[PDB]
A paper describes a structure:
[name] (CotI) of [name] is a member of a family of proteins specific to the phylum Firmicutes, which are implicated in spore formation and often form part of the spore coat. The BSKs constitute a new family within the CAK kinases. CAKs adopt a protein kinase-like (PKL) fold, with distinctive CAK-specific structural elements. They usually phosphorylate small molecules, and are named for the choline and aminoglycoside kinase members, which were the first structures to be described.
The crystal structure of [name], at 2.5 Å resolution, has an overall similarity to previously determined CAK structures. [name] contains the PKL bilobed fold, with a smaller, mostly β-stranded N-terminal lobe, and a larger, mostly α-helical C-terminal lobe.12 The electron density indicated that a molecule containing an adenosine moiety was bound in the interlobe cleft, where the adenosine moieties of ATP/ADP are found in other PKL structures. This molecule was present due to copurification with [name]; it was not provided in the crystallization conditions (see “Materials and Methods” section). We therefore modeled the ligand as adenosine. However, the two primary adenosine interacting residues, W123YtaA and I256YtaA, are conserved in most putatively active BSKs, suggesting the observed interactions are both relevant and indicative of a family-wide pattern. In contrast to other CAKs, [name] retains the Lys (K72YtaA), but completely lacks the Glu partner, replacing it with S84YtaA, which does not form an analogous interaction. The missing Glu may be functionally replaced by D259YtaA in the Dxe motif (DLD in [name]). The remaining active site residues, which are required for metal binding and catalysis, are conserved in [name] (as in APH and ChoK), indicating that this protein is very likely to be catalytically active. Remarkably, the electron density maps for the [name] structure show additional density for an unknown ligand in this region. However, it is unlikely that this ligand could be the biological substrate of [name]: it is distant from the key active site residue D239YtaA (D166PKA), which directly coordinates the substrate hydroxyl group.
Residue numbers in the entry: 22 to 52, 57 to 357
The structure:
Amino acid sequence: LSAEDAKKLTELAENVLQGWDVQAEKIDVIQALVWKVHTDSGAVCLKRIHRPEKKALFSIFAQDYLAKKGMNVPGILPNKKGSLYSKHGSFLFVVYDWIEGRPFELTVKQDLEFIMKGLADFHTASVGYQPPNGVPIFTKLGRWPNHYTKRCKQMETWKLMAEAEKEDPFSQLYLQEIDGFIEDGLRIKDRLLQSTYVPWTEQLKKSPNLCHQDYGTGNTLLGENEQIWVIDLDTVSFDLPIRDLRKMIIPLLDTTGVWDDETFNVMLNAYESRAPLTEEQKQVMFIDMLFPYELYDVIREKYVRKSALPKEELESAFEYERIKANALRQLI
Ligand SMILES: Nc1ncnc2c1ncn2[C@@H]1O[C@H](CO)[C@@H](O)[C@H]1O
């Protein structure tokens, strides 16, 4: 939203679109930089991918694979030279079909069920994808134990700068209670190493599914004939499918009050109706859900980003970890 800056971006789109055979009539800047390009009668999406060329290609080819396989992801329009993308400077440009649909309302039960079935569809459909020759794989298979340790060591490291701010309620409460959550973090790592996590990750290294890694109401839509579409595949990588469940369910249920088990059931039941999980697989998920990822995000706002948050937000983050621990104690 600006004066000369808006016409600057519009002119970039017009210049880049010459590479495709698209009748550009009206161009709107939306969001990575995204444009809605209106044509004769129906639109296309022009996206400037921000990410480095190696990671960019992995997701571009992943999307082409999924689109051509029949999964509900926007298809890629080939350019005049027959390629899925054009390189200009340090950026990749891609033209996708603009999908028409409404966003989901997480307070409505049927939408919560739709969004989970689409996640299951995405996971199942992605199995078989391998990037082309020269494009390296992006994978996190078998890395969670190290990722937990890096985070438990990072929470210890932040006590150095926590002790620096002597007259600060957030840092005062942090120095008093954080050790108990760090200890539990490393104990959750130990529980993960006794689960089927390792054999499961090793079996998937051979024929892996993709994890979306940023799945939510911002990247999904309900189109015609109640079809669920997944829109932004820029952060896809190979990982256990349960990562997307955790990453979607735990933040949604974040609360200082009561654990919403009904919503938890509605979401897992909907996911499992299309991609059922064994008891062992679910154990791995529940173990991962106990790790303090949401507490970490709240701590990262205060020490890395330096946002002066008050004591209430730290205690509120600790309380959700306790509430969640009680809710999942019998499932791990
Ligand atoms: N191919 C696409 N189809 C539909 N919506 C899109 C596409 N790319 C980006 N968007 C939308 O842009 C909006 C941001 O204002 C989001 O709601 C997102 O769904």
